């Protein structure tokens, strides 16, 4: 506590370049995020895409996070037991892309972005563990 400490816990091991804790109920807003990166700028529109009823459109269209274009790999966000979505960013001109996981809790989304060459698997496991702790806390 408070939420910034969650961001430092998440960034501690050095695998990640970005993290965010985002409230998705009511009026959605970011509760903590690493400054000067991408997640710190997600919008309520971006959030509602993530958690909404339309779970197919984002395959052909992609979706965005803080303006960063990403492709959807796996969608289990609304599933009991998994509560996760895996994504890969899109880039232009041969610039590196990165893996992303969003995890959903009772009140929050947890968002993690890997550094270059970090496997989606490490990121998913990590974001999942943190979500799982939050669900266990009634969050």
């Amino acid at each position: 506590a408070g939420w910034n400490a969650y961001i430092d816990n998440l960034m501690a091991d050095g695998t990640c370049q970005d993290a965010a804790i985002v409230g998705y109920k009511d009026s959605p807003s970011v509760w903590a995020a690493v400054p000067g990166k991408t997640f710190v700028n997600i919008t309520p529109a971006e959030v509602g895409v993530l958690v909404g009823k339309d779970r197919s459109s984002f395959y052909v269209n992609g979706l965005t996070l803080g303006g960063q274009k990403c492709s959807v790999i796996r969608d289990s966000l609304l599933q009991d037991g998994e509560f996760s979505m895996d994504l890969r960013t899109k880039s232009t001109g041969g610039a590196p892309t990165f893996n992303v996981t969003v995890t959903k809790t009772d009140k929050t989304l947890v968002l993690l972005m890997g550094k270059e060459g970090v496997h989606g698997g490490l990121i998913n496991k990590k974001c999942y563990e943190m979500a799982s702790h939050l669900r266990r806390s009634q969050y």
């Binding site: 408070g2 400490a5 409230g23 509760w31 939050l134 009634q138």
Partner: peptide, 13 residues
């Protein structure tokens, strides 16, 4: 408005 207080971190190993 404002966000809730954060719960305690998961103990470490």
């Amino acid at each position: 408005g404002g966000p809730p207080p954060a719960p305690p971190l998961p103990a470490a190993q």
